[PDB]
Amino acid sequence: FDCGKPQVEPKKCPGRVVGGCVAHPHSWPWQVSLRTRFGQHFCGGTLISPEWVLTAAHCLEKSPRPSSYKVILGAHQEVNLEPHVQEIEVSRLFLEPTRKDIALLKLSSPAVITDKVIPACLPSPNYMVADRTECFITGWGETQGTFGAGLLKEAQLPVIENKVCNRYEFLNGRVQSTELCAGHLAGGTDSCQGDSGGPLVCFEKDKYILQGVTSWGLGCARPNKPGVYVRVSRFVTWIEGVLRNN
């Protein structure tokens, strides 16, 4: 299975939809659920190869021990995992040094690549997603009793170019180049999307490319403000670097 090519067609929730949608099961096969050693889903991540998951550094705040983390792959249900889900322990935690906003998780054993577990592709270094590029943020979310509680959801977000996002009216110059914005400049969601560390993928040509990593700390979308994500393209040399040495 090539990276970024789901074997189940994402339903591709229309942007207008409030609350996003429930994902077509396994249509986002790189979607990882980071868990404590006690079955608790508390973060999202993106499978980027069979032994590596990309997630937000914030997800690693509770513990510095790789062993404290379980990466579950191929899931749709948050609690009642289908019998095929893969549960793999993290053996390594590499914090991106320059920004420390994302971290790579090496899996104890390589993930078995199937039609439900396929990594997301990585963009070319420095690629800058074009303004208005439609992308989807996926994840389980924390809120419970809410629409799609316990189900992998997705929300379509258009990318808001940095020059526009940084206008004083939106992010007023707080977003760096190592970051990217996504979400309508008006009418947007008044809530943090996906999961901390979850994927922001954008279809391009043949496949989905992981263009952002969710990090609510950078900023969640307000009705009149897009959310801010870590721009993966500015960390690809670091990632591929960490992946060929370790």
Swiss-Prot record:
Transmembrane segments: none annotated. It comes from the Eukaryota. The record marks 16-17 as: Cleavage. Disulfide bonds join 3-121, 13-21, 43-59, 135-202, 165-181, 192-220. Residues 17-244 form the Peptidase S1 domain. The active site is at residues 58, 101, 196. Changing residue 27 to P: In PLGD; risk factor for thrombosis. The modification Phosphoserine is found at residues 33, 124. Changing residue 187 to R: In PLGD; Kanagawa-1; 50% activity. This is Plasmin light chain B. The chain holds residues 565 to 810 of 810 of the full protein.
